[PDB]
Structure 1
Amino acid sequence: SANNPWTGFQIFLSPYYANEVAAAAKQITDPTLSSKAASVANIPTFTWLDSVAKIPDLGTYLASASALGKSTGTKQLVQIVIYDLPDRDCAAKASNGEFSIANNGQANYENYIDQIVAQIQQFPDVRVVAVIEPDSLANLVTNLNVQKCANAKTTYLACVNYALTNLAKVGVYMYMDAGHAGWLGWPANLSPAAQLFTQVWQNAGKSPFIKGLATNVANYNALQAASPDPITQGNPNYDEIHYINALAPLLQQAGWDATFIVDQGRSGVQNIRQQWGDWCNIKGAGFGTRPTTNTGSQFIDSIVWVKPGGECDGTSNSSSPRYDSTCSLPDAAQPAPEAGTWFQAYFQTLVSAANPPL
Structure 2
Amino acid sequence: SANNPWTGFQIFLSPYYANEVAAAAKQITDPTLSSKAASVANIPTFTWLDSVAKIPDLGTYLASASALGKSTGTKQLVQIVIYDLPDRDCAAKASNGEFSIANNGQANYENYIDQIVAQIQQFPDVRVVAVIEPDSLANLVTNLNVQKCANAKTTYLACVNYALTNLAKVGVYMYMDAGHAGWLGWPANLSPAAQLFTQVWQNAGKSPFIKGLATNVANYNALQAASPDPITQGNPNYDEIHYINALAPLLQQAGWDATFIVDQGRSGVQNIRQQWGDWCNIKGAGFGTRPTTNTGSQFIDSIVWVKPGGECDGTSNSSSPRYDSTCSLPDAAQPAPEAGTWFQAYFQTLVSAANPPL
The normalised TM-score by structure 2 is 0.99
State the alpha-carbon separation in 1 of the partners of residues 342 and 51 from structure 2: 17
Query: 1:130-178 CA distances to partner (integer Å, 9 max, x unpaired)?
Result: 0000010111111111111111111000000000000000000000000
Distance in 1, Cα, partners of 2:160 & 2:94: 21
What SS class does the counterpart of residue 145 from structure 1 fall into?
Answer: coil
Count the aligned residue pairs. Answer: 358
Matches within 5 A, 1:96-135: 96-135=96-135
Shift of 1:321: 1.6
Q: CA deviation at 1:279?
A: 0.4
On the 8 A contact 1:177/1:213 being kept in 2, the answer is yes
Q: Partners of 1:321 and 1:202 in 2: how far apart?
A: 39
Q: CA deviation at 1:29?
A: 1.1
Shift of 1:94: 4.2
CA apart distance, 1:96? 2.6
Query: For residues 159 and 344 of structure 2, what CA distance do their matches in structure 1 show?
Result: 34
Q: C-alpha offsets along residues 66-101 of structure 1, whole Å, 9 cap, x if unaligned?
A: 000000000000000000001111111344311111
Q: Residues 87 and 96 of structure 1 are in contact (CA less than 8 Å); yes or no, is this contact kept in structure 2?
A: no
Query: What SS does the corresponding residue of 2:138 show, helix, strand or coil?
Result: helix
What secondary structure is seen at the aligned counterpart in 2 of 1:78? strand
Q: CA deviation at 1:319?
A: 1.0
* Whole-angstrom distance in 2 between the partners of 1:149 and 1:29: 46
**Partner residue, 1:353:** 353
Q: 1:202 to 1:237 in 2, by over 3 A?
A: same
Whether contact under 8 Å (1:63, 1:123) holds in the other structure is: yes
Shift of 1:341: 1.0
State the secondary structure of the residue aligned to 2:275: coil
Distance of 2:86 and 2:225 partners within structure 1:
36
The alpha carbon displacement at 1:5 in A equals 0.1
- Structure 2 CA distance for partners of 1:340 and 1:95, relative to 1, 3 Å: farther
Distance in 2 (alpha carbons) for counterparts of 1:95 and 1:306: 19
Note if contact 1:13-1:44 (Cα within 8 Å) is conserved in structure 2.
Answer: yes
Tell me if the contact between 1:95 and 1:339 (Cα under 8 Å) persists in the aligned partners. no
Deviation of 1:322 after TM superposition, in Å, equals: 1.6
Return the offset for 1:236.
0.1
Using structure 1 for the length normalisation, give the TM-score: 0.99
CA pair 94-24 structure 1, distance change in 2 beyond 3 A: farther
> How many Å separate the matches in 1 of 2:263 and 2:95?
19
Deviation (angstroms), 1:189: 0.2
Aligned-pair CA distance for 1:126: 0.1
* Structure 1 unaligned residues grouped into runs of 5+: none
Q: Secondary structure at the match of 2:114?
A: helix
Shift of 1:14: 0.4
Superposed CA offset, 1:198-241 (max 9, x none): 00000100000000000000000000000000000000000000
1:62: Cα distance to partner?
A: 0.1
> C-alpha distance in 2, partners of 1:71/1:93?
47
More displaced stretch, 340-349 vs 294-303: 340-349
Structure 2 runs not aligned, ≥5 long: none
| Preserved contact between residue 94 and residue 315 of structure 1 (Cα < 8 Å) | no
User: Structure 1 CA distance, aligned partners of 2:304 and 2:131?
Assistant: 11
DSSP 3-state at the match of 2:131? strand
Q: What is the alpha-carbon root mean square deviation over aligned residues?
A: 0.6
Deviates more, 1:191-200 or 1:319-328: 319-328
Residues 94 and 313 of structure 1 are in contact (CA less than 8 Å); yes or no, is this contact kept in structure 2?
no
Select between 185-194 and 313-322 the one with higher mean Cα deviation: 313-322
Q: CA offsets, 1:235-266, max 9 Å, x none?
A: 00000000000000000000000000000000
Q: 1 CA distance for matches of 2:150 and 2:94?
A: 19
Give, in whole Å, the separation in 1 of the partners of 2:95 and 2:302: 26
Give the stretch that moved more between structures: 317-326 or 285-294. 317-326
**CA distance in structure 1 between the aligned counterparts of 2:357 and 2:245, rounded to whole angstroms:** 28
User: What does residue range 66-81 of structure 1 map to in structure 2 within 5 Å?
Assistant: 66-81=66-81
Q: Structure 1: how far apart are the matches of 2:93 and 2:119? A: 31
Q: Which stretch has the larger CA shift, 272-281 or 95-104?
A: 95-104
SS at match of 2:137: helix
Tell me which residue corresponds to 2:296.
Answer: 296
Confirm or deny: 8 A CA contact 1:50 1:82 kept in the other structure.
Answer: yes
> Is contact 1:268-1:285 (8 Å) kept?
yes
Measure how far apart 1:338 and its partner are: 1.2
- Cα distance in structure 2, aligned partners of 1:96 and 1:251: 32
Contact 1:94–1:314 (CA under 8 A) maintained in structure 2: no
